[model samples]
Target: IVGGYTCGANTVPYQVSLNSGYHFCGGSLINSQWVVSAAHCYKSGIQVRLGEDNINVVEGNEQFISASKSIVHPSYNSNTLNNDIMLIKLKSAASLNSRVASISLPTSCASAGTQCLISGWGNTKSSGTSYPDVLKCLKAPILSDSSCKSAYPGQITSNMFCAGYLEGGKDSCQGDSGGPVVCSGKLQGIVSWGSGCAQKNKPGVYTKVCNYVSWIKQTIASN
Candidate 1:
């Protein structure tokens, strides 16, 4: 779910075909009917693919489904990355299989310091360039509210959570934006931002999924 200026690269393990075949970072299935991702990924004529290791090839001709509608979080403000969540209602439900399945949204807030898994096709290291074609996944401990607040000072908000390495080598880098941070098989966060990818006093910031559970439920239920 990382965001960057590139063509034909997607954040999710799938490819999204847009006008002239451009692609962007996004997530796959969240539920049978929804594909969770960043609102910024939305564009006219966009299509999303899931469950494929390579965006270029579909093993069995399992092409991605076009979005029926792209719903960006109403409160989202790209300037601040606030309410950065969004959902893509696929034209049809994705096939149920091992590679493609719904990722559960956290029913409750995860305790501080809980470990979670984050994945995307972002840079391998902070301050590094983007990596095309390969998807990277990493495990990082969630930071305490106090710790995150202290790290970012006034930038940390109730809607955000932080996670990354204290020493700073391993982390979710650029281009991994809007990807999921999953714990206990439930989505706890969505990769949002950081001071500079993986920096010493700057941990990766994420959208707190539990806090937005109501919005998600309402959005999906009504749509």
Candidate 2:
């Protein structure tokens, strides 16, 4: 959330706060019973709070649900961060409303220079000094594959996409992992990892969702 700003209470209602008895990562509801996030965000005591803009207290409108199971992509690589996607099945289905809903999965990947929105309760400081009690939103442009290649070199994969500022000053930090990167009202990516909070020439790396649409569908269909 470096160089980011606040989001309206109702913006990105699909956004959720993933808690491990405390704020850990952000997530998005893909459907009533399923939530999508980063594979690395997995942890015990995981719970989801929907329709929540702030994570400091109870919200009458939000639904707190425990996870029954978490399914990480079998090919996920923690070292290289390849295929860094995960799905969590809620113990019970969520009830949709004006303030609570699911995001549509992208049918295709976004191209270079496509600006997208990422929302979360991640850190605002470059040092990640503190976590936000309230959700924040930011806009980042998808860099061309060549530019990303130049930056991450040997790191970017087809299952991964890059977005952020080359000059720095804006990017996602810790605590924002597993959040949505929405483009054209469709879920395009998931905040997976980054070199640092907002380093020079190092844009944030995200798991490209379009490349896994079939996997998501098949996984959900099976479970």
Candidate 3:
């Protein structure tokens, strides 16, 4: 994450890494056998690494599980990136511990100006290089829909929301897509897109998790 600091070990327990051979995306462990991530991060043989802190070292509490099923949003539009959310069911349930656990989903929508936390193992440079081995986190404020829409005309939809400073110094960058944006200790957003990492007036855009609460619940219950 651009302009963020390394997260303390086990501090962000719900965090997970989506991998094929290397880290491609970050995800949230929302249940024992389910993970929430961005639709664009999906791959047929994706693996989920839970309880990860530093990717360069084996953290001992890590649980590597292959995805059993990947369910992308039905109305997900790749071109526009609207409804860019997905769910991955694990082949086996994760064993919860101090360093591995699920996070509660949001019950209410996050309002503008709310300070939220975003963590990832993505690039720390807007140049798209320099990925961090350790997870990094940044605190950014949620921007209003109008403000977000103004930044990118005809692009910001209800399914999306923007976060980060207008003058930009911090944001989730490449490899951070599908990461969690936790507000008030609830999973509120999923890192999705942005114009450029930490660019001025181009805040990091995320999938509005509140809008998909019912869908997530329904899907988990049925499957």
Give per-residue lDDT, candidate 1, residue 160.
90
Estimate the TM-score of every prediction.
0.86, 0.98, 0.98
Better of 1 and 2 by lDDT: 2
lDDT of each: 0.70, 0.90, 0.93
Clashing pairs in 1: 1-176, 1-177, 2-175, 2-176, 2-177, 11-25
lDDT of 3 by residue, 1-223 (tens): 9999988987999999998989999999998999999999988889999988888799688899999999999999999999999999999999998899898999899999999999999999986599888999999899989899999999989889999988988889989999999999999999999998999989999999999999999999998
Query: Candidate 1 regions off by >4 Å?
Result: 1-23, 60-62
- Ten consecutive residues with minimal summed lDDT in candidate 3? 126-135
- In candidate 1, what are the lDDT values of residues 26-109, reduced to their tens digit? 474777668777665556676766664454555553457777988999988888787878888889877766556677777898
Please name the candidate that would achieve the greatest lDDT relative to the true structure: 3
Error of 1 at 41 (Å): 3.2
Model 2: weakest 10-residue lDDT segment is 125-134
Expressed as tens digits, the lDDT of each residue in 1-223 for candidate 2 is 8889889786788999889888899888999999999999988789899988778877677899999999999999899989999999999999999889999999878999898999898888886476887888999988888988899889999988889998988898888999999998999999988888888988999999999999999999999
Candidate 1: worst-modelled 10 consecutive residues by lDDT: 11-20
Clashing pairs for model 3 are none
